[PDB]
Design a protein around this nucleic acid. Structure first.
Ligand code: MG
Length: 792
RNA sequence: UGGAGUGUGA
C-alpha cells in the first residue's frame, strides 16, 4: 500500500510566525509535451549533448519547430510547451565533428494531475510534470551558471576567495521545485562547494605541498598525495602560440623528462612538461576536504540567519524568473517573497533528578539547562578502574591529579568514583597499544581476585593518529573493556564544565542514567507509557565517495529499560558497498534446524531479558535514506521486522511506526521579526522546540519540521521527520510532542539535540563501527560491552 | 577523542 496519510494538524505550543525559504509557483495550463532525444554516436557528456541540442535549435527554430522553444533536460529528454508541428524528423549537427539527432514525440503530461495532487485530492505525485517544470525553470540557470546537479553556482556573484592548499570555494544558490501544501515551491537556498583555482601546475603543486620542490624530488607519500589530488584534472597546453588543445590527465610518469625543469617527472596525457601548463577553470574537487580546509569553508558558509535570509531574497530577485523566455513562454510564474509560515513553540518537558539534591527538578529555559544543585538519577559506584598514559608531555603526578579531579567531579555530580585505582598509573608509548592493553587487563584480573575492570581512563595525544581506533577496537572486540579516552590539552587545562561532561559520559558508559522526563517517571506519556514499547533506530553510513574496498556499515539501536526509557543498546555489521538497505536485520541459515538471527531479534531478546517482559509496541526511527527509495526501504525493513518478530515467538506481531528522519535538505525557517526577543538567546536562529507542519510540507502524507535545538552559530537546519508507516495510530500532537521530548533525554549533553537520540545513537554506533574492520563480517563485540552504551 | 551546534538530498 501507499504511505500513512496525515491525521491532522498540531495544536500544542504557543503560536508564532516564521519565514520559510519556499517561493510560491503557479502551475500553467499549456499541454506540455516531451520529445525524446537520440544522438548517434552516443556520447554521455551532458554539456556536449546540450550544446548539440542548442545548435540544432538555432539552426532549425524557424524551419519546422513552429517558433516553439524547446527545453532539453541535458541527456535524453526534450520538453516543449504545446506540440511541435512535426512528429519524427532528424537533423544533422556539425560542431568539424558531425552528429545525427533523432527527435520523436513521446507523450503529453498532465498539469491537472499536478493540481489535483497539490490540492490534496489524491496521493500519487506527478514526477513527470514536476521534473518538466524543474528543468524548464533551470534552463536559464544552466546556461548562465555551472550545474553541479540541483545547484547552479558561479563566480563574480560572491567574490570566491582562498580556501586552502590550492583549491578554493565558490558560492551560489540551490534550486529544486517541490510539491508542497500551498502549491509548487521553488526551494532556493544558498550553497557552496570547492573548486580548483586556475593556477599553473608549478604554483598549484607548490601550494598543495606548501613548500618548494625545485631541487627536492617527491617522496613516495608526496607522490601518492599528488596523484590522488590530480587524478581527474583537465589541463591545457600554453607553450604553443595558438594551439588551445586540452589533455585530461590521470597518470603521471615515473621517470624525469631527460630519462627546463626536467628533474621532476612530467605529466603524461607524449610527456607534457609541467612548467608550461595551466589548470582549466571550472573543475570540481572530488572526495572529501581535510580538517584544515573544512573550517575555512565553514567561516564562509556559516552566516547569520538575517544575512542568509537577505542573501536568499537577493538571489531570487537576481534570477528574474518573470523575464526569462523559457518561463514566459511556458506560463511559469514564480513569486519573490518568503512564505509567512505559522509555527508553534512546543514547551520544554520537566526533567527529574535525584532526590538527594538541592534541586529535584529542572525546566529547560531555552533548550539548555545546567547540572548545578542536581544529582543523577542513577549513580554506578565504580570500584575498579585503571589508567594508561599514552603521552609523554603529561607526567605521572599530573595524570593522577587529573584522575582525582575527574573523580571528585563525578562524586559531586552524583557518582561514587573510587578514590584510588586498582594498579598505579604507568606511561606507555602509542605504538605498543596492544601490549599495553593486554598487560593492564591481565594485571587487573590478577589483582582484585579475578574481577574484571569497570573503566579505563586513557590520556592519548592530541593528534594521535591510528591510535583511538585501534584502542577502541582492541578494548571492544578482544579484551572487553570500557575506556574514556581524553586529549592531552584538556588534561593540562582542567575545566569544571569539561569534567562534568566527561562525568555525564562515563555515567551512561557504565549502566544507569543521569536524567529522566517527569512524564516518563509518572507513566504519563501519550500512547507510550501505557504499555511497554521498544524504540528502535537505524542508520547506514556509506564510505567516502569512491571507496569500494571499505564496505558500508549499518547500525541498529533499541531502548532497553521500560519505566524511564533512556538506555539504548546497539549492534553493528558490514554489508556491500553503497548499499542503502540493511541485509542483517534478519538472517536464516542451516544449522542442526534453521537458527535465526539479525539485529531486530537480538535487540528484542535483550530488551525482554533486561525488563522481564516482551515489548508490546515498536516505534522505528530510520535514518540515512535518500528520498529515492522510501518504498523499497520501507518494504524490506518492515518485512524483516515482521519476520524477526514472528520467529522470536509465534503470533507475536507488535504494532510498528516506521519514521524516517533526515536533516539533509534545504528548507530553512527564519524569525519573522529580527528586532524582537522572540528568537534564540543569541542574535540568531528561531526558538528551540518549534514545529512546522503547514504550507511547506507534503500535501497528503504525514511529515513535519522540528527545530528542537538551540543553534549556536549560523542558520540552524530543522530536522525532517516522515512517518511512512503508522500502526499505533499516532495523533499529530502526540507524535510531535514525543519526538520533541526525546530530544531532551540525550545522555552525553545537557542540551536538546537536533535529531532524536535513537537515530543519533544509531549514527554514532555506525560511525564507531568503522574502527572495528581490519572482510564482510565485522569482529564480534564482547558480551560485556553490548549491554552498555559503548559508543557514547 | 568533553559536548552540543554550523557545508553536499546518490
Ligand atoms: Mg547517519
Amino acid at each position: 500500500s501507499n504511505f500513512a496519510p496525515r491525521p491532522g494538524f498540531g495544536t500544542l505550543g504557543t503560536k508564532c510566525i516564521v519565514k520559510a525559504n519556499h517561493f510560491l509557483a503557479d502551475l500553467p495550463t499549456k499541454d506540455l509535451n516531451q520529445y525524446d532525444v537520440t544522438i548517434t554516436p552516443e556520447v554521455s557528456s551532458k554539456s556536449v549533448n546540450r550544446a548539440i541540442i542548442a545548435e540544432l535549435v538555432r539552426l532549425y527554430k524557424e524551419s519546422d519547430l513552429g517558433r516553439r522553444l524547446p527545453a532539453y533536460d541535458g541527456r535524453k529528454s526534450l520538453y516543449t510547451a504545446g506540440e511541435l508541428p512535426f512528429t519524427w524528423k532528424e537533423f544533422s549537427v556539425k560542431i568539424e565533428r558531425s552528429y545525427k539527432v533523432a527527435i520523436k514525440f513521446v507523450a503529453r503530461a498532465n498539469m491537472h494531475h499536478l493540481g489535483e495532487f497539490l490540492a490534496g485530492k489524491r496521493a500519487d505525485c506527478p514526477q513527470e510534470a514536476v521534473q518538466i517544470l524543474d528543468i524548464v525553470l533551470r534552463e536559464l540557470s544552466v546556461k548562465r551558471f555551472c550545474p553541479v546537479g540541483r545547484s547552479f553556482f558561479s563566480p563574480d556573484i560572491k567574490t570566491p576567495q582562498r580556501l586552502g592548499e590550492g583549491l578554493e570555494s565558490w558560492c551560489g544558490f540551490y534550486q529544486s521545485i517541490r510539491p508542497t501544501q500551498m502549491g509548487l515551491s521553488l526551494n532556493i537556498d544558498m550553497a557552496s562547494a570547492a573548486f580548483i583555482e586556475p593556477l599553473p601546475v608549478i604554483e598549484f603543486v607548490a601550494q598543495l605541498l606548501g613548500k618548494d620542490v625545485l631541487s627536492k624530488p617527491l617522496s613516495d607519500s608526496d607522490r601518492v598525495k599528488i596523484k590522488k589530488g590530480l587524478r581527474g584534472v583537465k589541463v591545457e597546453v600554453t607553450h604553443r602560440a595558438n594551439v588551445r588543445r586540452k589533455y585530461r590527465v590521470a597518470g603521471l610518469t615515473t621517470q624525469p623528462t631527460r630519462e627546463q625543469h626536467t628533474h621532476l617527472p612530467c605529466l603524461q596525457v607524449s610527456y607534457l612538461p609541467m612548467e608550461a601548463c595551466k589548470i582549466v577553470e571550472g573543475q570540481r574537487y572530488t572526495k572529501r576536504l581535510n580538517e584544515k580546509q573544512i573550517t575555512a569553508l565553514l567561516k564562509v558558509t556559516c552566516q547569520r540567519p538575517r544575512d542568509r535570509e537577505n542573501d536568499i531574497l537577493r538571489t531570487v530577485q537576481h534570477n528574474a524568473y518573470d523575464q526569462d523566455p523559457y518561463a514566459k513562454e511556458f506560463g511559469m510564474n514564480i513569486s519573490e517573497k518568503l512564505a509567512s509560515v505559522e509555527a508553534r513553540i512546543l514547551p520544554a518537558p520537566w526533567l527529574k533528578y535525584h532526590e538527594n539534591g538541592k534541586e529535584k527538578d529542572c525546566l529547560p529555559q531555552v533548550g539548555q539547562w545546567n547540572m548545578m544543585n542536581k544529582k543523577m538519577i542513577n549513580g554506578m559506584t565504580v570500584s575498579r578502574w585503571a589508567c594508561v598514559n599514552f603521552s609523554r608531555s603529561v607526567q605521572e603526578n599530573v595524570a593522577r591529579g587529573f584522575c582525582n579531579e575527574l573523580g571528585q567531579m563525578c562524586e559531586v555530580s552524583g557518582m561514587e568514583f573510587n578514590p584510588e585505582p586498582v594498579i598505579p598509573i604507568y606511561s606507555a608509548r602509542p605504538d605498543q597499544v596492544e601490549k599495553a592493553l593486554k598487560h593492564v587487563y591481565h594485571t587487573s584480573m590478577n589483582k582484585t581476585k579475578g574481577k574484571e575492570l569497570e573503566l579505563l581512563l586513557a590520556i592519548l595525544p592530541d593528534n594521535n593518529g591510528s591510535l583511538y581506533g585501534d584502542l577502541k577496537r582492541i578494548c571492544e572486540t578482544e579484551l572487553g573493556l570500557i575506556s574514556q579516552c581524553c586529549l592531552t590539552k584538556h588534561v593540562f587545562k582542567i575545566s569544571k564544565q569539561y569534567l562534568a561532561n566527561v562525568s555525564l559520559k562515563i555515567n551512561v558508559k557504565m549502566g544507569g542514567r543521569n536524567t529522566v522526563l517527569v512524564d516518563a517517571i509518572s507513566c504519563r506519556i501519550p500512547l507510550v507509557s501505557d504499555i511497554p514499547t521498544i524504540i528502535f533506530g537505524a542508520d547506514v553510513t556509506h564510505p567516502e565517495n569512491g571507496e569500494e574496498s571499505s564496505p558500508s556499515i549499518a547500525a541498529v539501536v533499541a531502548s532497553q529499560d521500560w519505566p524511564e526509557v533512556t538506555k539504548y543498546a546497539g549492534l553493528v555489521c558490514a554489508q556491500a558497498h553503497r548499499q542503502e538497505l540493511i541485509q542483517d536485520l534478519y538472517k536464516t541459515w542451516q544449522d542442526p534446524g534453521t537458527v535465526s538471527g539479525g539485529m531486530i531479534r537480538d535487540l528484542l531478546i535483550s530488551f525482554r531479558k533486561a525488563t522481564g517482559q516482551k515489548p508490546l509496541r515498536i516505534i522505528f526511527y530510520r535514518a540515512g535514506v535518500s528520498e529515492g527509495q522510501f518504498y523499497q526501504v520501507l518494504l524490506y525493513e518492515l518485512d524483516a521486522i515482521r519476520k524477526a518478530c514472528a520467529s522470536l515467538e509465534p503470533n507475536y506481531q507488535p504494532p510498528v511506526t516506521f519514521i524516517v528522519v533526515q536533516k539533509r535538505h534545504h528548507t530553512r525557517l527564519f524569525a519573522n521579526n529580527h528586532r524582537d526577543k522572540n528568537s534564540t538567546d543569541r542574535s540568531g536562529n528561531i526558538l528551540p522546540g518549534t514545529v512546522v507542519d503547514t504550507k511547506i510540507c507534503h500535501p497528503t502524507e504525514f511529515d513535519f519540521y522540528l527545530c528542537s535545538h538551540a543553534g549556536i552559530q549560523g542558520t540552524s537546519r530543522p530536522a525532517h521527520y516522515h512517518v511512512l508507516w503508522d500502526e499505533n495510530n499516532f495523533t499529530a500532537d502526540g507524535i510531535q510532542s514525543l519526538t520533541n521530548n526525546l530530544c531532551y533525554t540525550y545522555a552525553r549533553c545537557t542540551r536538546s539535540v537536533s535529531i532524536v537520540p535513537p537515530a543519533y545513537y544509531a549514527h554514532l554506533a555506525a560511525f564507531r563501527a568503522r574502527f572495528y574492520l581490519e572482510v564482510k563480517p565485522l569482529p564480534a563485540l564482547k558480551e560485556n560491552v553490548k549491554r552498555v552504551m559503548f559508543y557514547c
